[PDB]
Design a binder for this molecule. Structure first.
Ligand code: CL
Ligand code: CL
Ligand code: CL
Ligand code: CL
Ligand code: CL
Ligand code: CL
Ligand code: FE2
Ligand code: FE2
Lengths: 497, 497
């Protein structure tokens, strides 16, 4: 077989990106300042973290084994529990004590035949007493919220109609439904999208099969009262390329950013309208809602070139690292309209941004608060001379959070410091009676001075000030998505406003 | 109550001495070089590591909660398992989420009444299918060698005659006995020493009660074929001082270094002879044996002043940090002699040394190989300018290992590098047929450049060369004693030569 390296090599596993690969507990974490005693619940986050050195050189960040962190908060005390998802990949590679799964989303490069290729490293969400560890090429993996034990691959009591489950399901605060989909829903290179939803009782509600114009990456989607929206990243899959050992994804400069709109209830596949936004990269969705006119307001990160530059076009054409900026875009869509081309979006701020969060109590409805990561290149904000040599590569950089008030237009910016970078933030309602976007923000910091991770707790009253700084004595590798599960929420999700 | 700090403060918990307090697993550790495939067994080590910040300012290193590391070796692969001993202290402080036990060995400063005050941080040894986590003020805590689960306080099936069990029991390679003792054997300030042994079947053999001339610290002891030897450190205990909030230990410049010799079998308390070595500090025993003349050769680290300077005499008189050197001393004792004063010892090498190990296959018999820690102050060996600001305080420093051949007088010195310090080494016989001191040496390194720990594997054929360097992505806080449990040894201890 291809030889298995016995230590990590390359930029993707250097400095702060070096895997730690620890599982277990650190209770009673060190705290500078004071954690508000009223905060009770768990911050779950997932990071890609290769358990074994890959036989694939410069294996992308997105292909690392999912490791779940839980920060358990009560009476101003916090404990860390950390455990890898027991994917088929993790278990078989652990047994063999060497890497067996090959290139990102290319089964033809695997050293053994996998049934499930999930790294379960995309997202970690709460649904009906379980954690779901999500990866958009696979079904979810169900886990115990208390122990982080893996129960196994989850098929919703045999109801799961799709081979694939999105990393970005939406939770309706009114209906208590989990609104889902999968792309490549019938296997590698298929244009089949399965749109499906589950009621709070766990019974499947919607199941609509539709066809994508191209086999494009649909990473995120949006849900309104009456519509579901599928923005397609112009990364396109050719299974014949994959069979020769090629990349799953290849940029296509010749296609628009397709935005499919489907009626949310009682629709057929043919009811989908594929609107055509100006060519660009579909980033993460903040939220979507229908205004008084009944028009969809789609608010999402949007770039004008390939953010995933490591997957260029057929002739290897694409941007360089740190060249492409994503901006907080508003797209207006009308399902009634027969005009497929969409106008350029309006931009809500000028910041290079990503990883937008709202108060999920107004998810699928009009929101007036967004929290998002920013990358400010303004001199001095990040000491690049100090950070970059310690940073490694393969992961996006954010050197602050921003809070946008959509009513007033006021922006607050949290800057952790010149030698610190942030992950995706979570929002915690102050209590069940709290106004929209009123409460606490938590965000994991990479401290490049200490080569340690920190968990910052902010009050939305003043986002510039750390109320508490939780000091971890180890590195948590830069990760992807995380979620708050409040103790006062019986189904793990907050009550509607 | 005295307020509980929510983060660690002071030199004893700064830099590399900052508690990590992690429990769990890191499997398939990164390896530079090659671990010999024939090595099969576990390296167990214990470190003091406070689980919660103390309410006692500048709490000594020796008062930290015992955390057990296990390095499990097979076919050139190694896994780390890490778990705290579930002492009464650990469990009750974990329940309270704050420190409750007060000053080192002073129950009158405790915020609650403890039955057992053990931190189980002294040593971790194998006996009859269990680990024993040792602390000289308490009985052992029994643990699972595989899972590091704590079974609880161990009383040897109700046979334990003493309130105290030494951190330095001796394993006779011929008789397969565990030879033990406890000082302060009837509680705080008592001059009672209980000498006791267990046969390989777990039945108690010897139990002799004797009286110490003073209530002095007997940290280590020595066992020969026919004698047991108790060197007393001139640190003396006054319970009346303790009741006023004073130190358990206070140096006494007016007494010799007492060395008690007792017949190993069938003795009474009154059979002990208290010989009087020149005033000095009794360091760790390498080994003792009877020569052809029947005289005891006692080989141990020996200093001329108080190594534990933080416990000075009644008027606060004592040395400064890094001032006192310990030297590899040979004391000659004759149980038959009526002359109590002993001559100054002969010195086997000139090195400032401690933590001596032998091939334990010749324990209690003539040995011709010793491995020990050294601290070379020769300029350039340690980059003090770089290390000291990152080092913290409270723990002894060693910047190399030495192998002494007692026959030839040849010394090999392992220097890990200018920005690395060592812990206590272990010796592993190459195989069951290997000559004395022939095989492998392992030692945990503190790497002050990476602020990470490393486990170095050396061949005794050439101690200057690292055969393998196991790269931990976390710090293991400087610790005390560790032991090898070879897979080929059913009772966990090597066969006699
Ligand atoms: Cl890798
Ligand atoms: Cl599991
Ligand atoms: Cl992160
Ligand atoms: Cl402390
Ligand atoms: Cl336990
Ligand atoms: Cl150590
Ligand atoms: Fe995502
Ligand atoms: Fe010791």
């Amino acid at each position: 077989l291809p030889p298995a390296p016995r230590y990590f090599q390359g930029e993707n596993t250097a400095g702060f990106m070096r895997p730690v690969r620890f599982e277990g507990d650190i209770t009673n974490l060190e705290v500078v300042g004071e954690i508000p005693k009223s905060i009770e619940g768990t911050f779950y986050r997932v990071m890609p973290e290769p358990h074994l050195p890959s036989f694939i050189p410069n294996d992308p960040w997105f292909n690392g084994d999912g490791n779940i962190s839980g920060f358990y908060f009560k009476d101003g005390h916090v404990d860390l529990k950390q455990r890898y998802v027991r994917t088929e990949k993790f278990v078989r590679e652990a047994e063999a004590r060497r890497s067996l799964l090959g290139k990102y989303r290319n089964r033809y490069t695997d050293l053994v035949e996998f049934k499930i290729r999930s790294t379960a490293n995309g997202n970690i969400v709460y649904w009906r007493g379980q954690l779901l560890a999500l990866k958009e090429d696979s079904p979810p993996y169900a886990m115990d919220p208390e122990t982080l034990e893996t129960f196994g691959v989850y098929d919703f009591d045999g109801q799961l109609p799709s081979l694939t489950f999105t990393a970005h399901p939406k939770f309706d605060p009114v209906t208590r439904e989990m609104v889902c989909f999968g792309y490549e829903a019938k296997g590698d290179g298929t244009r089949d999208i399965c749109y499906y939803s589950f009621g709070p009782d766990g019974k499947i509600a919607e199941t609509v099969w539709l066809v994508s114009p191209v086999c494009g990456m649909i990473h995120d989607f949006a849900v309104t009262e009456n519509f579901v929206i599928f923005p397609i990243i112009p990364l396109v899959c050719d299974v014949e390329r994959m069979k020769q050992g090629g990349d799953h994804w290849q940029w296509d400069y010749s296609i628009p950013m397709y935005i499919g709109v489907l009626p949310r209830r009682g629709a057929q596949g043919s009811d989908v309208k594929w609107f055509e936004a100006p060519h660009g990269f579909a980033g993460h969705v903040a939220n979507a809602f229908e205004d008084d006119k009944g028009h969809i307001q789609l608010q999402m990160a949007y770039a004008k070139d390939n953010v995933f530059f490591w997957w260029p076009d057929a002739n290897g054409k694409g941007p360089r690292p740190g060249e492409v900026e994503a901006h907080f875009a508003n797209f207006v869509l009308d399902y009634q309209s027969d005009k497929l081309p969409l106008a350029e979006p309006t931009y809500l701020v000028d910041d290079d941004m990503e990883f937008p969060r709202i108060d999920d109590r107004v998810a699928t409805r009009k929101h007036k608060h967004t929290f998002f990561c920013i990358f400010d290149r303004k001199p001095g904000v990040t000491d690049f001379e100090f950070v970059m040599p310690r940073a490694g590569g393969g992961a996006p950089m954010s050197n602050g959070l921003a809070h946008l008030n959509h009513e007033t237009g006021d922006i607050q910016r949290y800057l952790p410091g010149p030698r610190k970078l942030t992950g995706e933030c979570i929002f915690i309602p102050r209590n069940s009676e709290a106004a929209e976007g009123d409460g606490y923000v938590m965000v994991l910091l990479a401290n490049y001075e200490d080569m340690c991770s920190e968990l910052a707790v902010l009050d939305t009253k003043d986002l510039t000030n750390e109320v508490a700084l939780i000091k971890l004595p180890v590195r948590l590798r830069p990760g992807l998505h995380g979620n708050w599960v409040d103790k006062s929420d019986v189904d793990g999700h907050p009550a509607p406003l």
